[PDB]
RNA sequence: GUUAAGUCUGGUUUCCCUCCAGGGUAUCUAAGUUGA
């Protein structure tokens, strides 16, 4: 609310909110806020009438309703803005799919149902989840998304940088019956997003979180990759890059495994380090531990690719479902690698 | 006062090692699922 204003008006609204703060008063704090509103009407030369009695009371009553109910009161402009941004993000994702040799079955606004090669699925997931939040570097036709908005030749249309987004991936044999393939895709993307909890901190406190993940499945293997690790998934221009940050790590690691700098034994050798590292309790200890686990399959001479130290302590939970999952994000990273390869 | 004649023995006994140091340091592994 206080940020929604542009101009000296923000002072009035935040001091009203302070009058709403801690059940402070009505009919009483309507002076401090008013000794500025009347100041403002006297700050001009042609004002006609003021019923500040009614007006500041209604202005406080608005925010009081907002907070008591607990939701921004929706007006038609809200709906048409969300829907327009939905369609524009859809236009972005249409050429994001086409950027990765994909075939759209249904891409409409919020959702998506495409078919891509098993090779560029991770790239597409990353770039799509970022473009949904208006954060990208490509021109996608006539549309050049810019850090939370959608620039279209000087037109800055909004985006959905607050809305999370889940992702299901089914690595399927071309002879697999599409009935069960589509049903498994839908049932993962439904069950899992409601049923999984992964560690997140907002306000500096390790809490849980449910949506905005990426589930993978390969004929029995499953993995989940959290996409935000922040509950106001972005609130600054800073956190725009944090989106899908775990995915570029998996992409880099797959970039090392292919070129023959790491051996796929990496994907079968993390279990022994996992006991040590999840009971481990210091940062740089676990840092060196993963560095040397990789440095038994080697990544490089004079190692250069470490895991970015935000990935540890992240524990993924599940509400006791047949979907078995490792309780930690790095084991899920390596299962995502197993699932991607298993389809190549 | 005088005569003669030398004869016996032919190195023993102790101590033969004592004390400390009995490994130290560095490396502790690196580099690397595909087809029906
Ligand atoms: Mn649903």
CA of A210 to C1' of B24 (A): 58
d(CA A109, CA A88): 8
Is residue A122 packed enough to be buried (19+ CB in 10 Å), middle (13-18) or exposed (0-12)?
buried
Q: Are the C-beta atoms of A230 and A200 separated by less than 8 Å?
A: yes
d(CA A198, CA A225): 10
Which residue, among A335, A326, A328, has the nearest Cα to A278 in the 3D structure?
A328
Distances (CA, A) of A208 to A222, A226, A255: 21, 12, 31
> Ligand 1 mean position to A190 CA, how many Å?
5
Which residues, other chains included, contact A140 with Cβ-Cβ below 8 Å and sequence gap of 6+? A91, A92, A95, A96, A99, A131
Resolution (in Å) of the shown entry?
Answer: 2.7
Q: Of all helices (H) and strands (E), which one includes residue A331?
A: helix A329-342
Is A44 (CB) below 7 Å from strand B?
no
Count of C-beta atoms within a 10 Å radius of residue A197: 14
Helix axes A245-258, A329-342, angle to 10 degrees: 50
Q: Are the C-beta atoms of A205 and A337 separated by less than 8 Å?
A: no
d(CA A231, CA A164): 9
For chain A, the first-to-last Cα distance in angstroms comes to 50
Which bases of strand B have any atom within 7 Å of the beta carbon of a protein residue?
A: 29-35
Q: State the structure-solving technique.
A: cryo-EM
């Amino acid at each position: 609310l206080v940020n929604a204003g542009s101009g000296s008006i923000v002072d009035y609204v935040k001091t009203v909110l302070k009058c709403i703060r801690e059940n402070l008063n009505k009919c009483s704090c309507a002076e401090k806020i008013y000794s500025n509103e009347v100041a403002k009407v006297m700050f001009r030369v042609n004002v006609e009438k003021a019923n500040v009695e009614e007006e500041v009371k209604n202005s406080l009553e608005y925010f009081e309703t907002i907070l008591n109910e607990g939701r921004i009161i929706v007006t038609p402009a809200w709906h048409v803005s969300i829907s327009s941004a939905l369609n524009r993000g859809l236009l972005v994702e249409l050429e994001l799919v086409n950027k990765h040799k994909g075939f759209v079955i249904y891409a409409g606004g919020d959702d998506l149902l495409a078919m891509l090669p098993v090779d560029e699925v991770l790239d597409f997931i990353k770039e799509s989840r970022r473009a949904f939040a208006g954060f990208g570097t490509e021109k996608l036709g006539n549309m050049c998304l810019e850090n939370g908005f959608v620039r279209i030749n000087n037109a800055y249309y909004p985006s959905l940088p607050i809305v999370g987004r889940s992702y299901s991936v089914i690595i399927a044999h071309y002879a697999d019956p599409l009935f069960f393939v589509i049903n498994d895709s839908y049932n993962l993307l439904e069950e899992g997003k409601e049923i999984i909890r992964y560690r997140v901190m907002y306000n500096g406190e390790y809490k849980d979180a449910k949506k905005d993940v990426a589930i993978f499945r390969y004929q029995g293997l499953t993995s989940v990759i959290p996409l935000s690790l922040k509950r106001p998934i972005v609130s600054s221009v800073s956190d725009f890059n944090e989106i899908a940050s775990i995915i570029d790590v998996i992409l880099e690691l797959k970039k090392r495994i292919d070129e023959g700098r790491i051996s796929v034994s990496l994907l079968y050798d993390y279990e022994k380090y996992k006991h040590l590292i999840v009971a481990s309790d210091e940062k740089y200890l676990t840092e060196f531990l993963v560095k040397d686990w990789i440095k038994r399959n080697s990544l490089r001479k004079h190692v250069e690719f470490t895991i970015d130290e935000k990935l540890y302590g992240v524990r993924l939970t599940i509400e006791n479902y047949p979907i078995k999952i490792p309780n930690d994000l790095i084991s899920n990273i390596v299962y995502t690698l197993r699932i991607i390869y298993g389809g190549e």
